[PDB]
Each structure stands twice: as structure tokens, then as C-alpha cells.
Design an enzyme around this catalytic site. Structure first.
Site, mmCIF file in Angstrom:
data_model
loop_
_atom_site.group_PDB
_atom_site.id
_atom_site.type_symbol
_atom_site.label_atom_id
_atom_site.label_comp_id
_atom_site.label_asym_id
_atom_site.label_seq_id
_atom_site.Cartn_x
_atom_site.Cartn_y
_atom_site.Cartn_z
ATOM 1 N N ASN A 105 0.842 -1.195 0.000
ATOM 2 C CA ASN A 105 0.000 0.000 0.000
ATOM 3 C C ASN A 105 0.884 1.255 0.000
ATOM 4 O O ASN A 105 2.115 1.176 0.059
ATOM 5 C CB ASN A 105 -0.989 -0.041 1.173
ATOM 6 C CG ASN A 105 -0.391 0.426 2.488
ATOM 7 O OD1 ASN A 105 0.815 0.365 2.714
ATOM 8 N ND2 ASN A 105 -1.256 0.890 3.377
HETATM 9 O O1 LIG Z 1 -10.336 -6.836 3.593
HETATM 10 C C1 LIG Z 1 -9.747 -5.956 4.282
HETATM 11 O O2 LIG Z 1 -10.381 -5.412 5.227
HETATM 12 C C2 LIG Z 1 -8.289 -5.538 3.974
HETATM 13 O O3 LIG Z 1 -7.639 -4.956 4.777
HETATM 14 C C3 LIG Z 1 -7.695 -5.829 2.596
HETATM 15 C C4 LIG Z 1 -8.380 -6.410 1.543
HETATM 16 N N1 LIG Z 1 -7.594 -6.507 0.490
HETATM 17 C C5 LIG Z 1 -8.072 -7.083 -0.767
HETATM 18 C C6 LIG Z 1 -7.980 -6.402 -1.986
HETATM 19 C C7 LIG Z 1 -8.474 -6.976 -3.160
HETATM 20 C C8 LIG Z 1 -9.082 -8.229 -3.107
HETATM 21 O O4 LIG Z 1 -9.590 -8.853 -4.256
HETATM 22 C C9 LIG Z 1 -9.183 -8.883 -1.894
HETATM 23 O O5 LIG Z 1 -9.781 -10.141 -1.861
HETATM 24 C C10 LIG Z 1 -8.695 -8.320 -0.730
HETATM 25 C C11 LIG Z 1 -6.384 -5.996 0.797
HETATM 26 C C12 LIG Z 1 -5.211 -5.865 0.029
HETATM 27 C C13 LIG Z 1 -4.074 -5.300 0.583
HETATM 28 C C14 LIG Z 1 -4.096 -4.873 1.905
HETATM 29 C C15 LIG Z 1 -2.842 -4.243 2.466
HETATM 30 C C16 LIG Z 1 -1.612 -4.661 2.010
HETATM 31 C C17 LIG Z 1 -0.477 -4.054 2.508
HETATM 32 C C18 LIG Z 1 -0.589 -3.038 3.452
HETATM 33 C C19 LIG Z 1 -1.829 -2.617 3.894
HETATM 34 C C20 LIG Z 1 -2.961 -3.222 3.388
HETATM 35 C C21 LIG Z 1 -5.250 -4.981 2.680
HETATM 36 C C22 LIG Z 1 -6.400 -5.555 2.113
HETATM 37 O O1 LIG Z 2 2.502 7.172 9.483
HETATM 38 C C1 LIG Z 2 1.864 7.528 8.463
HETATM 39 O O2 LIG Z 2 1.810 8.721 8.080
HETATM 40 C C2 LIG Z 2 1.137 6.468 7.677
HETATM 41 O O3 LIG Z 2 1.718 5.999 6.754
HETATM 42 C C3 LIG Z 2 -0.293 6.030 8.100
HETATM 43 C C4 LIG Z 2 -0.876 4.795 7.863
HETATM 44 N N1 LIG Z 2 -2.082 4.757 8.386
HETATM 45 C C5 LIG Z 2 -2.981 3.625 8.257
HETATM 46 C C6 LIG Z 2 -3.240 2.667 9.236
HETATM 47 C C7 LIG Z 2 -4.131 1.635 8.961
HETATM 48 C C8 LIG Z 2 -4.754 1.563 7.722
HETATM 49 O O4 LIG Z 2 -5.647 0.539 7.412
HETATM 50 C C9 LIG Z 2 -4.502 2.504 6.759
HETATM 51 O O5 LIG Z 2 -5.129 2.430 5.504
HETATM 52 C C10 LIG Z 2 -3.611 3.523 7.031
HETATM 53 C C11 LIG Z 2 -2.357 5.934 8.958
HETATM 54 C C12 LIG Z 2 -3.507 6.381 9.622
HETATM 55 C C13 LIG Z 2 -3.556 7.660 10.149
HETATM 56 C C14 LIG Z 2 -2.457 8.502 10.034
HETATM 57 C C15 LIG Z 2 -2.585 9.904 10.619
HETATM 58 C C16 LIG Z 2 -3.235 10.092 11.832
HETATM 59 C C17 LIG Z 2 -3.388 11.365 12.347
HETATM 60 C C18 LIG Z 2 -2.901 12.450 11.639
HETATM 61 C C19 LIG Z 2 -2.270 12.262 10.410
HETATM 62 C C20 LIG Z 2 -2.117 10.990 9.890
HETATM 63 C C21 LIG Z 2 -1.323 8.072 9.363
HETATM 64 C C22 LIG Z 2 -1.270 6.766 8.825
#
Ligand SMILES: O=C(O)C(=O)c1cn(-c2ccc(O)c(O)c2)c2ccc(-c3ccccc3)cc12
Ligand SMILES: O=C(O)C(=O)c1cn(-c2ccc(O)c(O)c2)c2ccc(-c3ccccc3)cc12
Ligand SMILES: Nc1ccn([C@@H]2O[C@H](COP(=O)(O)OP(=O)(O)OP(=O)(O)O)[C@@H](O)[C@H]2O)c(=O)n1
Ligand SMILES: Nc1ccn([C@@H]2O[C@H](COP(=O)(O)OP(=O)(O)OP(=O)(O)O)[C@@H](O)[C@H]2O)c(=O)n1
Ligand SMILES: O=C(O)C(=O)c1cn(-c2ccc(O)c(O)c2)c2ccc(-c3ccccc3)cc12
Ligand SMILES: O=C(O)C(=O)c1cn(-c2ccc(O)c(O)c2)c2ccc(-c3ccccc3)cc12
Ligand SMILES: [Ca+2]
Ligand SMILES: [Ca+2]
Lengths: 209, 211
Positions: B28
Site C-alpha cells: 500500500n
Molecule cells: O479486507 C480488508 O479489510 C483488507 O484490509 C484488505 C483487503 N484486500 C483485498 C484487496 C483486493 C481483493 O480482491 C481482496 O480479496 C482483498 C487488501 C489488500 C491489501 C491490503 C494491504 C496490504 C499491505 C498493506 C496494507 C494493506 C489490505 C487488504
Molecule cells: O505514518 C503515516 O503517516 C502512515 O503511513 C499512516 C498509515 N495509516 C494507516 C493505518 C491503517 C490503515 O488501514 C490505513 O489504511 C492507514 C495511517 C492512519 C492515520 C495517520 C494519521 C493520523 C493522524 C494524523 C495524520 C495521519 C497516518 C497513517
């Protein structure tokens, strides 16, 4: 001196990222740095260089080089397609994703309580070789491919790919293969030594034609 | 000034990478910046900080901070399990992949079934409640919420606070929100990473003097 003057060069470098949704994707570990060194050496030697960069945000843009930024393998494809007709050399150093999520979600995916169905991306390099074969790229003099290889040795798969891709030059991670039978080993040195060898083989190919 | 002196703080930041084979992965676009800034503001106020870092935006190891670099959500889980008995504060800022490929290839691959990764924040809350983390005084979670047809940012932030069970949930509105387990909701005003990192740590220190 300047052996690439008047040469217009299109280079891709870095990996692509295939989005699953706004935030996630499929990616690779390639750095793009050997591609950047070739773009840089080419510009240092007088080429007018356009560089289509993928997943390379930590890298310094090479001086004198037109930057074109992409994310996706399809975005890389359309950027090449936009910029290919005017270039004389194309270097495909990018690790282009061969597959893609079949459908990309418009919001952050949050599943139930799963799988990723995939579809195939176009071989940009092979599309370029083909387009030149069909008369679509009259300014193009050299198509260069990249390969990291290692049922045969490193050279079984490297020739096999050189033939399959139909391009002028294949740089293998080392070896340098020409479509006219010549092969030169690449002694494992710096990326600047490597980039220079690659650009010498290019000018040598251009002069041989 | 040095309110956090003597506090052992464990911080995760970045995004995890779930390998498909030796070269490709699922990832991501998390930068890690806000979590590094928290870990920096925590150290500059006296805390002894450990930072478990996934993939970030080329961020440099903050100085004064113990660094553990991880790749996958499972590796992140293992490093948190290892370091959590020492910590007094857990700050879960990382984006931890909720899924990984069911099979990793041993060589460049030439559909992807997914299986689920553990909820590390939730395993922390359960562990402290089961009495396995006597030193843990505060468990902080992070969230990035957008608000949709079913609820605004706060509607989703509230559901996540209640589901996860942590003491403080930092919500970035994709302003933002700081939600406490006592029901306090403070708005996060726009600022730089450093300003907001100071607001977050302010919030942690107020929670701690309150305990
Ligand atoms: O399901 C969730 O709540 C959920 O976090 C996710 C669901 N997918 C996903 C997408 C497409 C698909 O087809 C499917 O089956 C499932 C994800 C893919 C990547 C990540 C991820 C990878 C690295 C860092 C942070 C997040 C997180 C999810
Ligand atoms: O440290 C960072 O800036 C980073 O990369 C972050 C990754 N997440 C995060 C976690 C779980 C998830 O499922 C997801 O999609 C993303 C964050 C969530 C919130 C924040 C944040 C909070 C308050 C003020 C500003 C930024 C920053 C990040
Ligand atoms: N969809 C694709 C895939 C690859 N390439 C180009 O093809 C060359 C590499 O081809 P390849 O060896 O097939 O990459 P891999 O997917 O790693 O190879 P393999 O299938 O043998 O494992 C590079 O110049 C790359 O820029 C491309 O243009 N379009
Ligand atoms: N497998 C996971 C997933 C999340 N986190 C932590 O849990 C918090 C909430 O992240 P988020 O992805 O919003 O939680 P989910 O409920 O999994 O998210 P969503 O609503 O999008 O499904 C974050 O501090 C994160 O570091 C974790 O510890 N382990
Ligand atoms: O420029 C870089 O450093 C980068 O990231 C590369 C990405 N690939 C690549 C391309 C296509 C693929 O299918 C794939 O798996 C990977 C490369 C292939 C070879 C080299 C290389 C060539 C000669 C000497 C040293 C290194 C560098 C890269
Ligand atoms: O097949 C190939 O030669 C082939 O390039 C790939 C095959 N997969 C793949 C993996 C897991 C699966 O479950 C499956 O069905 C197929 C890939 C996944 C990602 C990438 C990639 C992504 C970004 C940059 C470069 C490469 C490339 C391939
Ligand atoms: Ca999730
Ligand atoms: Ca392939």
C-alpha cells in the site's frame, strides 16, 4: 566526447504498481536505478532523453532529462505509445507488471470473512518491436530490452528471451546480447560502469546500421 | 517539557509487504511519516522509543530510537510480540496488511488466494486484559477514515474504537479525530506532521497522568 548527439532516447525504469483499490496494489522490489543510470549516461553523451519512471520516488531526476511519471503497467504502456513515434532509441529497463487486478475498487476494500482475480497486461516491449515491424515507427533505430535471469543456465533463458522478444539488444542480469549474434560479458562493476557499457553497445549498434 | 521521561514506547509505522514470490508483493501507499514524527516527538520529550518500521517513503531512522525493520504483517506481529513486554506505550501506526497470499513462490512466478493476517492491535489489547503485559499502560491505534454513504468519518471512527478496544484511536480524515476509551472526542486540527505528532503525544501524556 558526445557520441549520442541528435539521438532522441525513450527510457522506462522502475517497477509498476497495479492498483487493487486507491491505497493498495501489486508491486515488485526493483529499484529503477540501473535504468536511471542509462538515461543519465545517454544525456551526458548528447542524447535528447525522455524518461518514463515508475516506482522511483526516492531517486534523483537525471539532469537534462524529460521526466514522465507513471504508476501502472497500462499507464506505462500509454506513455510509451505517446512518446514512441518520435524517438530513435527505446530502452525498456522497467520491470513491467505482467498481471493486473481484474477489477480495481473505487474505495478502500474491506472484506467479509477472499482472492484476487488477475488479468494480463500488454507486453509493451513486444508491442514496440511489432509496431516497428508494421511500419508504425519509422524513426526507431534501436529497441533495447532488460532481463534478470538465472533447465539451462543464465544463457539458456537469456538467448531464449532475446529471440522471443525480437529486439535489437537484451541486457541480462551480467551479459549483453545483440540480435546479430554478438555477446559481451558484463563484469560486475558499478552502475555507472554498467550504464556506460550499455550506451557504448547502443552507439555501436547505431553506427553498425 | 520532558513529560515522557521514563516511559518505554513501542511504535509501528509504514506499510507491510505481503510476498507473492521473491520479487513481487502486495503493498500500500503508506509513507510512515506521521508515525515516525510521533516516535520522534516521543523521544524528544524523554521517552525511550523502539520503532518497528515497514515500508515507508524513504524515511531515515529517527535518532535516539531503536529500529526494527520488518517486511510482512506476520513479521510485524512477531516483532511486536517480542518487544511488547518491555513497553509502557504501544502506538500502532503501521498499515498492517489484513491479507497475504496463501502460497509464496520460491522463485519468480512465470488468481491469488488470500488468507488473513492476525490483528496485532487486537492481540495487544487482549494480551493486556489477559494479564500478559503488566507494564503496558496505553495502547494507541491509528485509522484513516473517509466517511461514506453509511456514516461520516466519526461514525466509522467510533465503530473502530469500540471494536478494537484500545485506549486512544487517532483518526485522520481522508482534519481528524482523537477518540479516547472514556468517550472523549477531540478534533485533530490540520497541521504539519510535527505539529500533529505533538497533539497526539499530548493526548497520550494526558491519558497517562490520568491513569
Ligand atoms: O479486507 C480488508 O479489510 C483488507 O484490509 C484488505 C483487503 N484486500 C483485498 C484487496 C483486493 C481483493 O480482491 C481482496 O480479496 C482483498 C487488501 C489488500 C491489501 C491490503 C494491504 C496490504 C499491505 C498493506 C496494507 C494493506 C489490505 C487488504
Ligand atoms: O505514518 C503515516 O503517516 C502512515 O503511513 C499512516 C498509515 N495509516 C494507516 C493505518 C491503517 C490503515 O488501514 C490505513 O489504511 C492507514 C495511517 C492512519 C492515520 C495517520 C494519521 C493520523 C493522524 C494524523 C495524520 C495521519 C497516518 C497513517
Ligand atoms: N508486460 C511487459 C513485461 C515485460 N516488459 C519488458 O520485457 C522485458 C523483460 O521481459 P520478461 O523477462 O518477460 O520479464 P519477466 O516477467 O520477469 O520474465 P519471465 O516471464 O521470463 O519470468 C523488459 O524490458 C520489460 O521492460 C514489457 O515491456 N511489458
Ligand atoms: N491486521 C491488523 C490490521 C490493523 N492493525 C492495526 O489496527 C489499527 C486499525 O487499522 P485499520 O486497517 O483501520 O483496522 P481495520 O479494522 O482492519 O480496517 P478496515 O475498517 O478498513 O477494515 C491500526 O492501528 C493498525 O496498525 C493491526 O494491528 N493488525
Ligand atoms: O533499473 C533497475 O535497477 C531495475 O529496477 C531493473 C528491473 N529489471 C527488470 C526488468 C524486467 C523484468 O521482468 C524484471 O523482473 C526486472 C531489471 C533487469 C536488469 C537490470 C540490470 C541489467 C544489467 C545490469 C544490472 C542490472 C536491472 C533491472
Ligand atoms: O507470470 C509471470 O511471468 C509474471 O510476471 C507474474 C505472475 N504473477 C502472479 C503472482 C501470483 C499469482 O497467484 C499469479 O496467478 C500470478 C505476478 C505478480 C506480480 C508481477 C509484477 C508486479 C509488479 C511489477 C513486476 C511484476 C508479476 C507477476
Ligand atoms: Ca482491513
Ligand atoms: Ca513474466
Amino acid at each position: 566526447h558526445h557520441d549520442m548527439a541528435g539521438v532522441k532516447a525513450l527510457v522506462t525504469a522502475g517497477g509498476t504498481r497495479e492498483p487493487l483499490d486507491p491505497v493498495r496494489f501489486i508491486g515488485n522490489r526493483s529499484s529503477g536505478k540501473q535504468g536511471y543510470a542509462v538515461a543519465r549516461v545517454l544525456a551526458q553523451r548528447g542524447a535528447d532523453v525522455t524518461l518514463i519512471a515508475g516506482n522511483t520516488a526516492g531517486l534523483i531526476d537525471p539532469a537534462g532529462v524529460e521526466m514522465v511519471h507513471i504508476g501502472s503497467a497500462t499507464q506505462l504502456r500509454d506513455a510509451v505509445s505517446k512518446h514512441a513515434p518520435d524517438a530513435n532509441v527505446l530502452v525498456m529497463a522497467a520491470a513491467v507488471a505482467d498481471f493486473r487486478p481484474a477489477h480495481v475498487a473505487a474505495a478502500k476494500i474491506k472484506k467479509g470473512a477472499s482472492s484476487i482475480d488477475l488479468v494480463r497486461n500488454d507486453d509493451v516491449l513486444a508491442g514496440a518491436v511489432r509496431a516497428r515491424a508494421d511500419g508504425q515507427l519509422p524513426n526507431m533505430r534501436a529497441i533495447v530490452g532488460f532481463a534478470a535471469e538465472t533447465n539451462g543456465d543464465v544463457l539458456f533463458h537469456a538467448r531464449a528471451k532475446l529471440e522471443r522478444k525480437g529486439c535489437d539488444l537484451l541486457v541480462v542480469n551480467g551479459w549483453l546480447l545483440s540480435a546479430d549474434g554478438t555477446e559481451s560479458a558484463l563484469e560486475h562493476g558499478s552502475k555507472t560502469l554498467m550504464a556506460t557499457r550499455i550506451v557504448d553497445s547502443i552507439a555501436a549498434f547505431l553506427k553498425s546500421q
